[PDB]
Amino acid sequence: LVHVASVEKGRSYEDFQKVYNAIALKLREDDEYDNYIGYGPVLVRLAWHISGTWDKHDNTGGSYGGTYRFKKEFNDPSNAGLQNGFKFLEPIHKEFPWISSGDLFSLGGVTAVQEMQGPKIPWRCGRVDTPEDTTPDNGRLPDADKDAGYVRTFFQRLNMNDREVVALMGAHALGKTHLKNSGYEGPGGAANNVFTNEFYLNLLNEDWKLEKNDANNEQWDSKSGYMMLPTDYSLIQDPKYLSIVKEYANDQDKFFKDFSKAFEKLLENGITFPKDAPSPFIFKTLEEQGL
Give the nearer residue to ligand HEM in terms of CB position, either 114 or 231. 231
CB 142, min distance to ligand HEM, A:
4
Task: Please choose, out of 20-28, 92-100, 178-186, 216-224, the segment that lies near ligand HEM by the rule CB under 6 A.
Answer: 178-186
Task: List binders of ligand HEM among 212-241 (CB under 6 A).
Answer: 229, 231
Residues 118-137 that bind ligand HEM (CB under 6 A): none
CB of 185 closer than 8 Å to CB of 213: yes
Nearest approach, Cβ of 40 to ligand HEM (angstroms)? Answer: 8
178 binds ligand HEM (CB under 6 A): yes
* Rounded Cα distance, 148 and 160, in Å: 14
Should residue 41 be labelled a site residue for ligand HEM when binding is judged by CB under 6 A? yes
Subset of 137-156 contacting ligand HEM (CB under 6 A): 142, 144, 151
In angstroms, give the least distance from the CB of 41 to ligand HEM. 4
Beta carbon nearer to ligand HEM, 99 or 158: 158
Among 20, 184, 241, 256, binds ligand HEM (CB under 6 A): 184
Binding pattern for the stretch 62-81 against ligand HEM, x by CB under 6 A and - elsewhere: -------------------x
CB-wise, 3 or 176, nearer to ligand HEM?
176
Answer for which of 5, 19, 44, 128 binds ligand HEM (CB under 6 A) is 44
Which residues make up the interface to ligand HEM (CB under 6 A)? 41-42, 44-45, 48, 81, 142, 144, 151, 168-169, 171-172, 174-178, 181-182, 184, 229, 231, 263
